[PDB]
């Protein structure tokens, strides 16, 4: 396993224009496209993205290549943060997957803001990251993926993989 194989377990892949859990227009694997209520302009968005006229459909070779631009983006986001950077240098493989997962979905901002956990996760409590971490409006919008990102966490293990939220987009 791997952080593609995750990511892909967790967004699923749709070829159409879709809704994410917070209503936001979004398509491919997790690709956001815009938190405004306009499908014109996340259809707009799509066409800047993909470099044609899409009408709101794209092959799965395109969404694929979002896919792995939307990877490296949130790595390069941990890179570039004060705060993420420090712990993501900290953790072992396993677990810095589980870090990268949780920036694709809420930001680097969002998970920057995870100030305590983070702590945690930087000094190896992992059973009490895991409580900090459900404490959380994440946890409790999309449990069933929080659940196996914290389980992740927790033993530095795929065991979970053997509830999509955000990324990338105006």
Same mark, same amino acid.
């Given at each position: 396993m791997n952080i593609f194989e995750m990511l892909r377990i967790d967004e699923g892949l749709r070829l159409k224009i879709y809704?994410?859990?917070e209503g936001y227009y979004?398509?491919?694997?997790?690709?956001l496209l815009t938190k405004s209520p306009s499908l014109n302009?996340?259809?707009?968005?799509l066409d800047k993205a993909i470099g044609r006229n899409t009408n709101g459909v794209i092959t799965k070779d395109e969404?694929?290549?979002?896919? @792995? *631009?939307?990877?490296?983006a949130a790595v390069?986001?941990?890179?570039?943060?004060?705060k993420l950077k420090p712990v993501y240098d900290s953790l072992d493989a396993v677990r810095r997957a589980a870090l990268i997962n949780m920036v694709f979905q809420m930001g680097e901002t969002g998970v920057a803001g995870f100030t305590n956990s983070l702590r945690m996760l930087q000094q190896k409590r992992w059973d009490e990251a895991a409580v900090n971490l459900a404490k959380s409006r994440?946890? @409790? *919008?999309?449990?069933?993926?929080?659940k196996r990102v914290i389980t992740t966490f927790r033993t530095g293990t795929w065991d979970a993989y053997k509830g999509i939220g955000h990324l990338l987009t105006k």
């Open positions: 809704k994410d859990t979004t398509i491919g694997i997790g690709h302009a996340a259809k707009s968005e969404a694929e290549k979002l896919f @792995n *631009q939307d990877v490296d390069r986001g941990i890179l570039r943060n004060a994440w946890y @409790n *919008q999309t449990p069933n993926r929080a």
